[PDB]
CSV table of C-alpha atoms and ligand atoms in Angstrom, one decimal:
chain,number,residue,atom,x,y,z
A,2,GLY,CA,100.0,124.3,60.6
A,3,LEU,CA,100.0,127.3,63.4
A,4,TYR,CA,97.9,123.9,65.6
A,5,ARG,CA,101.0,121.7,64.9
A,6,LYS,CA,103.9,123.4,64.8
A,7,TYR,CA,102.7,124.1,68.9
A,8,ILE,CA,102.5,120.4,69.1
A,9,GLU,CA,106.4,119.8,68.3
A,10,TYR,CA,107.9,122.1,70.4
A,11,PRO,CA,109.5,121.2,74.0
A,12,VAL,CA,107.4,121.7,76.8
A,13,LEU,CA,110.1,122.7,79.2
A,14,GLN,CA,111.5,125.4,76.3
A,15,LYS,CA,107.6,126.4,76.1
A,16,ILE,CA,106.7,126.6,79.3
A,17,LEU,CA,110.0,129.5,79.8
A,18,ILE,CA,108.0,131.3,76.8
A,19,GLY,CA,105.2,131.4,79.0
A,20,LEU,CA,106.6,133.0,82.4
A,21,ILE,CA,108.7,134.6,80.9
A,22,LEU,CA,105.4,136.3,79.2
A,23,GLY,CA,103.2,136.6,82.1
A,24,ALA,CA,105.4,138.4,84.0
A,25,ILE,CA,106.0,141.1,81.2
A,26,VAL,CA,102.4,141.5,80.4
A,27,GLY,CA,101.5,142.2,84.8
A,28,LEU,CA,103.4,144.7,85.2
A,29,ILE,CA,102.7,146.3,82.2
A,30,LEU,CA,98.9,146.1,83.0
A,31,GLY,CA,99.2,146.5,86.8
A,32,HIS,CA,101.3,150.1,86.5
A,33,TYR,CA,98.1,151.2,84.2
A,34,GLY,CA,95.8,150.4,86.6
A,35,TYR,CA,94.3,147.5,84.7
A,36,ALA,CA,94.4,145.0,87.7
A,37,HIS,CA,90.6,144.7,88.0
A,38,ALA,CA,89.9,143.3,84.2
A,39,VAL,CA,93.0,140.4,84.4
A,40,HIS,CA,91.0,139.3,88.2
A,41,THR,CA,88.2,139.4,86.1
A,42,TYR,CA,89.4,137.6,81.7
A,43,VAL,CA,92.7,135.4,82.8
A,44,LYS,CA,92.5,134.4,86.0
A,45,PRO,CA,89.6,131.5,84.7
A,46,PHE,CA,92.3,130.4,82.0
A,47,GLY,CA,94.9,129.6,86.1
A,48,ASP,CA,91.8,128.6,87.7
A,49,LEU,CA,91.2,125.9,84.8
A,50,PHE,CA,94.8,124.7,85.1
A,51,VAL,CA,94.7,124.0,88.6
A,52,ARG,CA,91.6,122.0,88.3
A,53,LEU,CA,92.4,119.6,86.0
A,54,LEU,CA,96.3,118.6,88.5
A,55,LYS,CA,93.3,118.1,91.5
A,56,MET,CA,91.8,115.5,88.8
A,57,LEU,CA,94.8,112.8,88.1
A,58,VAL,CA,95.9,112.9,92.0
A,59,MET,CA,93.5,110.3,92.9
A,60,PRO,CA,93.2,107.4,90.6
A,61,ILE,CA,97.5,108.0,89.6
A,62,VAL,CA,97.7,107.7,93.3
A,63,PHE,CA,94.8,104.0,93.9
A,64,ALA,CA,96.2,102.6,90.3
A,65,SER,CA,99.5,103.1,90.7
A,66,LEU,CA,100.8,102.0,94.5
A,67,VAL,CA,98.6,98.7,93.5
A,68,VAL,CA,100.6,98.1,90.9
A,69,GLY,CA,103.6,98.6,92.3
A,70,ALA,CA,102.9,96.8,95.8
A,71,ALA,CA,102.2,93.6,93.2
A,72,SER,CA,105.3,93.8,91.0
A,73,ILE,CA,107.9,93.5,94.1
A,74,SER,CA,106.4,89.8,95.7
A,75,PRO,CA,109.5,88.5,96.6
A,76,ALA,CA,110.8,89.7,100.2
A,77,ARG,CA,114.9,89.8,99.6
A,78,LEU,CA,117.1,91.4,102.0
A,79,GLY,CA,120.5,91.6,101.0
A,80,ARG,CA,123.7,92.7,102.8
A,81,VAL,CA,124.9,95.8,100.0
A,82,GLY,CA,121.2,97.1,100.5
A,83,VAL,CA,121.0,97.6,104.6
A,84,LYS,CA,124.3,99.7,103.5
A,85,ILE,CA,123.1,101.7,100.7
A,86,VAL,CA,119.3,102.2,102.1
A,87,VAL,CA,120.5,104.0,105.0
A,88,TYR,CA,122.8,105.8,103.8
A,89,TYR,CA,119.8,107.8,101.0
A,90,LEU,CA,117.5,108.0,104.0
A,91,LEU,CA,120.4,110.1,106.5
A,92,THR,CA,120.8,112.5,103.5
A,93,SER,CA,117.4,113.0,102.7
A,94,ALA,CA,116.8,113.4,106.9
A,95,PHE,CA,119.5,115.9,106.3
A,96,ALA,CA,118.5,117.5,103.6
A,97,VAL,CA,115.2,118.6,104.9
A,98,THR,CA,117.0,120.4,108.0
A,99,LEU,CA,119.7,122.7,106.4
A,100,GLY,CA,116.8,123.6,103.8
A,101,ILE,CA,114.9,124.2,107.1
A,102,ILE,CA,118.6,126.7,108.3
A,103,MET,CA,118.3,128.0,104.6
A,104,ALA,CA,114.5,129.0,105.4
A,105,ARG,CA,115.6,130.6,108.5
A,106,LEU,CA,118.7,132.5,107.8
A,107,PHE,CA,116.9,134.2,104.8
A,108,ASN,CA,112.9,135.3,104.8
A,109,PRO,CA,111.3,133.8,102.1
A,110,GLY,CA,108.0,135.5,101.9
A,111,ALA,CA,107.7,136.9,105.4
A,112,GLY,CA,107.8,140.7,103.6
A,113,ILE,CA,104.3,139.9,101.7
A,114,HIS,CA,101.5,139.6,103.4
A,115,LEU,CA,97.7,137.9,101.6
A,116,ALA,CA,94.4,139.1,102.5
A,117,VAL,CA,92.1,137.0,100.3
A,118,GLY,CA,88.9,137.7,101.1
A,119,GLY,CA,89.5,139.8,103.5
A,120,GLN,CA,89.8,137.7,106.2
A,121,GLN,CA,93.1,136.9,107.5
A,122,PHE,CA,94.5,133.4,107.9
A,123,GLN,CA,93.1,131.5,111.6
A,124,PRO,CA,95.5,127.7,111.8
A,125,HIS,CA,92.9,125.7,114.0
A,126,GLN,CA,94.2,123.1,117.0
A,127,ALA,CA,95.1,120.2,115.5
A,128,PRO,CA,93.4,116.8,116.3
A,129,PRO,CA,94.8,114.0,118.3
A,130,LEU,CA,97.2,111.6,117.4
A,131,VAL,CA,95.5,108.5,118.2
A,132,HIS,CA,93.1,109.7,116.4
A,133,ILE,CA,95.4,110.2,113.1
A,134,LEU,CA,97.1,106.8,113.4
A,135,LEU,CA,93.5,105.0,113.8
A,136,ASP,CA,91.9,107.0,110.6
A,137,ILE,CA,94.6,105.2,108.8
A,138,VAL,CA,92.6,102.3,108.5
A,139,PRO,CA,89.5,103.3,106.3
A,140,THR,CA,85.8,101.9,107.3
A,141,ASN,CA,84.7,101.9,104.2
A,142,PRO,CA,87.3,101.6,100.6
A,143,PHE,CA,84.6,102.8,98.7
A,144,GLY,CA,83.6,105.7,101.2
A,145,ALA,CA,86.9,107.3,101.3
A,146,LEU,CA,87.8,107.5,97.2
A,147,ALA,CA,84.5,109.4,96.6
A,148,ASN,CA,84.9,111.5,99.6
A,149,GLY,CA,89.1,112.4,98.5
A,150,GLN,CA,90.0,111.2,101.3
A,151,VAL,CA,94.9,110.0,100.1
A,152,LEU,CA,95.6,108.5,103.4
A,153,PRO,CA,92.8,105.4,103.9
A,154,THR,CA,93.7,105.1,100.3
A,155,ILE,CA,97.5,104.5,100.1
A,156,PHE,CA,96.2,101.9,103.4
A,157,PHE,CA,93.6,99.6,101.1
A,158,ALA,CA,95.7,99.9,97.9
A,159,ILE,CA,99.1,98.6,99.5
A,160,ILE,CA,97.3,95.9,101.0
A,161,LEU,CA,94.9,95.0,97.9
A,162,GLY,CA,98.2,94.2,96.2
A,163,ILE,CA,99.9,92.2,98.3
A,164,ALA,CA,97.2,89.8,98.4
A,165,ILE,CA,96.7,89.8,94.9
A,166,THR,CA,100.3,88.4,94.8
A,167,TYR,CA,99.2,85.8,97.2
A,168,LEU,CA,96.7,84.1,95.0
A,169,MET,CA,98.1,84.9,91.7
A,170,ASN,CA,100.8,81.7,92.4
A,171,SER,CA,97.2,79.2,93.6
A,172,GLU,CA,96.9,76.0,93.1
A,173,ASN,CA,93.9,76.3,91.9
A,174,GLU,CA,93.5,77.5,88.1
A,175,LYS,CA,90.1,79.7,87.6
A,176,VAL,CA,91.6,81.8,90.7
A,177,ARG,CA,94.9,82.5,89.0
A,178,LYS,CA,92.7,83.8,86.1
A,179,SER,CA,91.1,86.1,88.1
A,180,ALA,CA,93.9,87.5,89.2
A,181,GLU,CA,95.1,88.8,86.0
A,182,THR,CA,92.5,90.0,84.7
A,183,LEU,CA,91.8,91.7,87.8
A,184,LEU,CA,95.2,93.1,87.4
A,185,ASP,CA,95.4,93.7,84.5
A,186,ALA,CA,92.3,96.6,84.3
A,187,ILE,CA,94.1,98.5,87.1
A,188,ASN,CA,97.6,98.1,85.6
A,189,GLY,CA,95.2,99.5,81.9
A,190,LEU,CA,93.9,102.5,84.0
A,191,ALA,CA,96.9,103.7,85.6
A,192,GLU,CA,98.7,104.0,81.3
A,193,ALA,CA,95.5,105.8,80.8
A,194,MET,CA,95.6,108.7,83.6
A,195,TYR,CA,99.6,108.9,82.3
A,196,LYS,CA,98.5,109.1,78.5
A,197,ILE,CA,96.3,112.6,79.9
A,198,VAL,CA,99.0,113.9,82.3
A,199,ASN,CA,100.7,114.5,78.9
A,200,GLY,CA,98.5,116.1,77.8
A,201,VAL,CA,97.1,118.2,80.1
A,202,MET,CA,100.8,119.2,80.2
A,203,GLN,CA,100.9,121.1,76.7
A,204,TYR,CA,98.1,123.2,78.3
A,205,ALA,CA,100.7,124.4,80.8
A,206,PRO,CA,102.3,127.2,79.2
A,207,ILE,CA,98.6,128.9,78.7
A,208,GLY,CA,97.9,128.3,82.6
A,209,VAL,CA,101.9,129.4,84.4
A,210,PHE,CA,101.1,132.5,81.6
A,211,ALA,CA,97.7,133.3,83.5
A,212,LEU,CA,99.1,132.6,87.0
A,213,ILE,CA,101.6,134.6,86.7
A,214,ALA,CA,100.2,137.7,85.2
A,215,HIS,CA,97.0,137.3,87.8
A,216,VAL,CA,99.6,137.2,90.5
A,217,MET,CA,101.8,140.1,89.6
A,218,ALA,CA,99.2,142.9,88.2
A,219,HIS,CA,97.2,142.8,91.6
A,220,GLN,CA,100.3,143.0,93.4
A,221,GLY,CA,103.8,143.7,91.9
A,222,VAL,CA,107.3,144.7,92.0
A,223,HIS,CA,107.9,144.5,95.7
A,224,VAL,CA,106.6,140.4,95.0
A,225,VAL,CA,109.7,140.1,92.8
A,226,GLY,CA,111.5,140.3,95.6
A,227,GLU,CA,110.4,137.7,97.8
A,228,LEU,CA,110.8,135.4,94.6
A,229,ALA,CA,113.7,136.0,94.6
A,230,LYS,CA,115.0,135.1,97.6
A,231,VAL,CA,113.4,132.1,97.7
A,232,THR,CA,115.2,131.3,94.3
A,233,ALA,CA,118.4,132.0,96.0
A,234,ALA,CA,117.6,130.1,99.3
A,235,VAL,CA,117.0,127.1,97.3
A,236,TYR,CA,120.1,127.5,94.9
A,237,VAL,CA,122.1,128.3,97.9
A,238,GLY,CA,121.2,125.2,99.9
A,239,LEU,CA,121.5,123.0,97.2
A,240,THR,CA,125.0,124.0,96.3
A,241,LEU,CA,125.6,123.5,100.0
A,242,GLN,CA,124.7,120.2,100.2
A,243,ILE,CA,126.9,118.9,96.9
A,244,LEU,CA,130.1,120.7,98.8
A,245,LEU,CA,129.2,120.4,101.9
A,246,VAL,CA,127.8,117.0,102.2
A,247,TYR,CA,129.3,114.5,99.2
A,248,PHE,CA,132.6,116.1,99.5
A,249,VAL,CA,133.3,115.6,103.0
A,250,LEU,CA,132.4,112.3,102.3
A,251,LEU,CA,134.2,111.3,99.8
A,252,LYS,CA,137.3,112.4,101.4
A,253,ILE,CA,136.8,110.2,104.2
A,254,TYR,CA,136.9,107.2,102.4
A,255,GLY,CA,139.7,108.2,100.1
A,256,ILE,CA,137.9,109.2,96.9
A,257,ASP,CA,139.4,112.0,94.6
A,258,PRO,CA,137.2,114.9,94.8
A,259,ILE,CA,138.4,116.8,91.5
A,260,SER,CA,138.5,113.1,89.8
A,261,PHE,CA,134.6,112.4,90.8
A,262,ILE,CA,133.1,116.1,88.7
A,263,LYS,CA,135.5,115.6,85.6
A,264,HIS,CA,133.9,111.8,85.1
A,265,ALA,CA,130.3,112.8,86.3
A,266,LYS,CA,130.4,115.7,84.2
A,267,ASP,CA,128.3,113.9,81.5
A,268,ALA,CA,125.6,112.8,83.9
A,269,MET,CA,125.5,115.8,85.7
A,270,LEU,CA,124.6,118.2,82.3
A,271,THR,CA,122.1,115.6,81.0
A,272,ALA,CA,120.0,116.0,84.1
A,273,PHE,CA,119.9,119.8,84.3
A,274,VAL,CA,118.8,119.8,80.3
A,275,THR,CA,115.8,116.6,80.7
A,276,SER,CA,115.6,117.5,84.7
A,277,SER,CA,113.8,113.9,84.6
A,278,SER,CA,115.8,111.3,87.0
A,279,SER,CA,114.3,108.8,85.2
A,280,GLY,CA,114.9,109.9,81.4
A,281,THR,CA,118.8,110.6,82.3
A,282,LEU,CA,119.0,106.9,83.7
A,283,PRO,CA,120.3,105.6,80.8
A,284,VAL,CA,123.2,108.0,81.2
A,285,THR,CA,124.3,107.8,84.2
A,286,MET,CA,124.5,103.9,84.2
A,287,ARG,CA,126.7,104.6,80.9
A,288,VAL,CA,128.9,106.8,83.6
A,289,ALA,CA,129.7,104.0,86.2
A,290,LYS,CA,130.9,101.6,83.4
A,291,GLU,CA,134.7,103.2,83.2
A,292,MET,CA,134.7,104.3,87.6
A,293,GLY,CA,135.6,100.5,87.7
A,294,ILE,CA,132.5,99.4,89.5
A,295,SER,CA,131.7,95.7,90.3
A,296,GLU,CA,129.3,95.3,87.0
A,297,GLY,CA,126.7,93.4,90.0
A,298,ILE,CA,126.1,96.1,92.3
A,299,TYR,CA,125.4,99.4,90.4
A,300,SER,CA,123.1,97.6,89.0
A,301,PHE,CA,121.2,97.9,91.7
A,302,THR,CA,121.9,100.9,93.1
A,303,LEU,CA,121.3,102.9,90.7
A,304,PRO,CA,117.8,102.5,89.1
A,305,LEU,CA,116.6,101.9,92.9
A,306,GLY,CA,118.3,105.5,94.5
A,307,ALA,CA,116.6,107.2,90.9
A,308,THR,CA,113.0,107.7,92.5
A,309,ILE,CA,114.3,106.8,96.3
A,310,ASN,CA,117.0,109.1,96.8
A,311,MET,CA,116.7,112.6,95.7
A,312,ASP,CA,118.0,114.7,97.7
A,313,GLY,CA,117.0,118.0,96.1
A,314,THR,CA,113.4,117.9,96.1
A,315,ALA,CA,113.1,117.3,99.7
A,316,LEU,CA,115.2,120.2,100.4
A,317,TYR,CA,112.7,122.0,98.2
A,318,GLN,CA,109.7,121.2,100.1
A,319,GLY,CA,111.2,121.9,103.2
A,320,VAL,CA,111.9,125.2,101.6
A,321,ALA,CA,108.8,126.0,100.1
A,322,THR,CA,106.7,125.6,103.7
A,323,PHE,CA,108.0,128.0,105.4
A,324,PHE,CA,107.3,130.5,102.3
A,325,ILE,CA,103.3,129.7,101.9
A,326,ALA,CA,103.7,129.9,106.2
A,327,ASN,CA,105.3,133.3,105.8
A,328,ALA,CA,103.1,134.3,103.2
A,329,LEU,CA,99.8,134.0,105.4
A,330,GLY,CA,101.0,135.5,108.3
A,331,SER,CA,101.4,133.3,110.1
A,332,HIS,CA,104.6,130.9,112.3
A,333,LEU,CA,105.6,127.6,112.3
A,334,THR,CA,106.2,126.2,116.0
A,335,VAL,CA,109.5,124.3,117.3
A,336,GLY,CA,106.9,120.7,117.4
A,337,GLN,CA,105.7,121.9,113.8
A,338,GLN,CA,108.9,122.5,112.5
A,339,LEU,CA,109.8,118.5,113.4
A,340,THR,CA,107.1,117.4,112.2
A,341,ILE,CA,108.4,118.6,108.7
A,342,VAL,CA,111.2,117.1,108.1
A,343,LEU,CA,109.2,113.3,108.7
A,344,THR,CA,106.7,114.5,106.6
A,345,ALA,CA,109.5,115.9,103.7
A,346,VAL,CA,111.6,112.6,103.7
A,347,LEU,CA,108.3,111.0,102.7
A,348,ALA,CA,107.2,112.9,100.3
A,349,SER,CA,110.8,112.5,98.3
A,350,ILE,CA,109.9,108.8,97.9
A,351,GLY,CA,106.7,108.5,97.2
A,352,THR,CA,107.6,111.3,94.2
A,353,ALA,CA,107.2,110.0,90.8
A,354,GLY,CA,109.9,111.6,89.5
A,355,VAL,CA,108.7,112.6,86.3
A,356,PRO,CA,109.8,117.0,86.5
A,357,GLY,CA,107.1,118.6,88.2
A,358,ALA,CA,106.3,116.5,90.3
A,359,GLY,CA,107.5,117.3,93.2
A,360,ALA,CA,105.7,120.2,93.6
A,361,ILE,CA,102.8,118.5,93.4
A,362,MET,CA,104.0,116.4,96.7
A,363,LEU,CA,104.6,119.9,98.1
A,364,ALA,CA,100.5,119.9,99.2
A,365,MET,CA,100.9,116.6,101.3
A,366,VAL,CA,103.6,118.1,103.8
A,367,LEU,CA,100.9,121.6,103.3
A,368,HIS,CA,97.9,119.5,105.1
A,369,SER,CA,100.1,117.5,107.7
A,370,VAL,CA,101.5,120.9,109.1
A,371,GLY,CA,97.9,122.4,108.9
A,372,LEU,CA,97.3,124.1,105.9
A,373,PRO,CA,94.7,122.7,103.5
A,374,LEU,CA,93.9,123.5,100.0
A,375,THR,CA,90.2,124.1,100.4
A,376,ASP,CA,91.0,127.2,102.1
A,377,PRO,CA,91.4,130.4,99.8
A,378,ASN,CA,94.4,131.6,101.1
A,379,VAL,CA,96.6,128.7,101.2
A,380,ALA,CA,95.2,128.5,97.3
A,381,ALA,CA,96.3,131.7,96.5
A,382,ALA,CA,99.4,130.7,98.0
A,383,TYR,CA,100.0,127.6,96.6
A,384,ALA,CA,99.1,128.5,92.8
A,385,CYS,CA,101.3,132.0,93.3
A,386,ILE,CA,105.0,129.5,94.0
A,387,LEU,CA,102.9,126.7,91.1
A,388,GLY,CA,103.7,128.9,88.4
A,389,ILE,CA,107.8,129.9,89.5
A,390,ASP,CA,108.5,125.8,90.0
A,391,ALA,CA,110.3,125.4,86.3
A,392,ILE,CA,112.8,127.7,87.2
A,393,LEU,CA,113.6,125.8,90.4
A,394,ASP,CA,113.1,122.1,89.5
A,395,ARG,CA,116.2,121.9,86.9
A,396,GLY,CA,118.4,123.1,89.5
A,397,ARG,CA,117.4,120.0,92.4
A,398,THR,CA,116.9,117.4,89.7
A,399,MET,CA,120.7,118.0,89.4
A,400,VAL,CA,121.3,117.3,93.2
A,401,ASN,CA,118.9,114.0,92.6
A,402,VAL,CA,121.5,112.4,90.3
A,403,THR,CA,124.2,113.5,91.8
A,404,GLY,CA,123.6,111.8,95.3
A,405,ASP,CA,122.9,108.6,94.0
A,406,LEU,CA,126.4,107.8,91.7
A,407,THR,CA,128.2,108.9,95.1
A,408,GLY,CA,126.5,106.6,97.2
A,409,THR,CA,127.9,103.7,95.2
A,410,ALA,CA,131.1,104.7,95.3
A,411,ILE,CA,130.9,104.8,99.0
A,412,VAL,CA,129.3,101.1,99.2
A,413,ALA,CA,131.5,99.8,96.4
A,414,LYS,CA,134.8,101.0,98.5
A,415,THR,CA,133.3,99.2,100.9
A,416,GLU,CA,131.3,96.2,99.3
B,1,LIG,N1,113.1,117.9,89.2
B,1,LIG,C1,113.0,116.0,89.9
B,1,LIG,C2,111.5,115.6,89.8
B,1,LIG,C3,110.6,115.9,90.2
B,1,LIG,O1,111.0,117.4,91.5
B,1,LIG,O2,109.4,116.2,91.0
B,1,LIG,C4,113.9,114.4,89.1
B,1,LIG,O3,114.5,114.8,88.3
B,1,LIG,O4,114.4,114.0,90.0
B,2,NA,NA1,118.7,111.2,99.8
B,3,NA,NA1,118.3,110.2,92.7
B,4,NA,NA1,111.0,109.9,94.7
């Protein structure tokens, strides 16, 4: 009865209820001097949610990359394909840069200080560039999976899928039969892990409630100030991206901006209430039918840019890195900021596109800068911004969908 009714309730609405309750409980308990009780009674619930998220990282990465690499067997570059790919990367790269400016004009987390364990954060010297590049190739494919190395796993997974499609269409019947069996076994593992992800998200409202309550109880009132600044900074950057970038480009080629906004309102509203680019993809394709765009051209750009042209996610990754860096009390050099731009844009493609996937890929750019998740101080900062992702997930989704439609219009105008 009670357990059943908890199941069919919307997950996005369920998470919002937990976040609101967590903030209210944390402030009340912290004000009465009960911050010690929450650290020993509700914190384990938050830690369990973090541990569950880390388990799904590797089996998804290895299985999905092998299937994806073997899926795209042909290598064809159309005349209109190069036009849309170069636009996608340029917008993604500039979106990160705009987020850096917003992350610098407003300080996300300069005021807050983290002293977990009584030891301040100490940065470590980065390895030489030559050594980093050579570590991509693994000396043991099984060792990389067991030792928790992500970069060697990606390189081996991609080449394994490419090797499969070469012998999948060979002249030997026995070789062909073995190729399908191996691919099907790997494909089944990828599908199974997606089901576990759905079950994990049902526990998210409990996990988010514990994380928010623990943060607010130990330190509150003031912490809301930094959380408001980072939330406003992302939205300010996103609304600037829509107006300063897309509107200017449309005016250059003569597209009427007011007509585009009125015609694309259905796609923008659908993305906000769903927060899934893949889920709102049928809506986006329906809108393009009335635009006068040729059938062939838009049917290739919108599916392609759905998981590759997420401009809002790239801006979110750049801003969130500065908030964590300021929280630890360290500073980012000019060389490190350029590194973030390269890492952030790559993480944009790697994001699956499902709600909450952007926060998962945020750890990737943190390791490149020099902020491993194994550090307890870094883990506390990451887990604190992890809870508030639901508020900042909807805003960047609309920007992701908006960039897809305007890219097709520009390339279609110039054929
Ligand atoms: N909100 C993103 C997904 C994500 O950020 O993980 C999208 O809908 O494209
Ligand atoms: Na882009
Ligand atoms: Na997109
Ligand atoms: Na992506």
